[PDB]
Design a protein around this ligand. Sequence first.
Ligand SMILES: CC1(C)C[C@@H](NCc2ccc(O)cc2)CCO1
Ligand code: NI
Length: 341
Amino acid sequence: TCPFYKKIPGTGFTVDAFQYGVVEGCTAYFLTHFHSDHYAGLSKHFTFPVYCSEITGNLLKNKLHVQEQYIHPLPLDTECIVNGVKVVLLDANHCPGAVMILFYLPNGTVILHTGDFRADPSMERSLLADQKVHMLYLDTTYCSPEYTFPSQQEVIRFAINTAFEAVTLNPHALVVCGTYSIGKEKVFLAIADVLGSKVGMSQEKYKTLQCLNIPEINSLITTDMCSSLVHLLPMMQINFKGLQSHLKKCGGKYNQILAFRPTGWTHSNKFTRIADVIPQTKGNISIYGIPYSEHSSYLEMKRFVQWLKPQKIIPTVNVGTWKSRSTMEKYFREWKLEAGY
Ligand SMILES: CC1(C)C[C@@H](NCc2ccc(O)cc2)CCO1
Ligand code: NI
């Protein structure tokens, strides 16, 4: 059964609702981005219209084998009519191809669905600047004041400087970066760039990255592991056992591993500044956890909502417990009383 927060009232539309079978009354299924909790249920046998970005469409065709006749890519920042309703796709500042969706209902109501997003002041000068938004379907992943983390730029500076120092001290060190989905590509791309290397990876990950429209990508990535001193591995292998095993496979080319685990928020954010971050070390292997987020911090979320001034907010994350729902509702009321809407 499809939950209420994935339905758009006054339309035949659902958002990120592919795991519920045939949804009664749904004439078009929107997909905000290619993450598995959101696409769960899509396959080569799906036969309803899917609306999404160009990049998400490339991934549906090549990774999930969805037939081309059912994929409806839409350009960004452009008014489009879908089944008689005006819609606009906006960049969500999440992973590649991720969008927010503006729906202009026939009755005059305007709804914004953020999908997954990292709010930014640059959104205050998109097509959102024009008109009023009545209902907001909000990515509330980190909707609590304890969730603080640095800018993406600060985290990348730390990673580049750490990697460059380690490999300049020891030219026989290998750098490894963990991954389990699309997103956070800047971490491994920026490190490879400072080291003058391509990024080496499996055939399967190479395929995924070739779908993302990244400029000059053929110059940056490879399946030839022997040519590369920055390797990508599954996130599950970023531990002392898995990294030791990987080092064995490299044939005595390297004598040290420096590894990065790009997490979201972790409790050590409450204590430590990005500059003060230290690795876990065993012998010739060091592992850094770095807080590279593709979701809004609490303060970023608050600023966006107080600017937008929506009449009603519908959370799409942390909806499963009464304590979470009550906590989020108290913050939304605080924000409204402070700003005066
Ligand atoms: C050069 C600028 C500043 C213009 C900006 N265009 C509008 C926009 C802003 C934010 C969005 O999330 C979506 C669209 C994108 C790139 O950066
Ligand atoms: Ni996501």
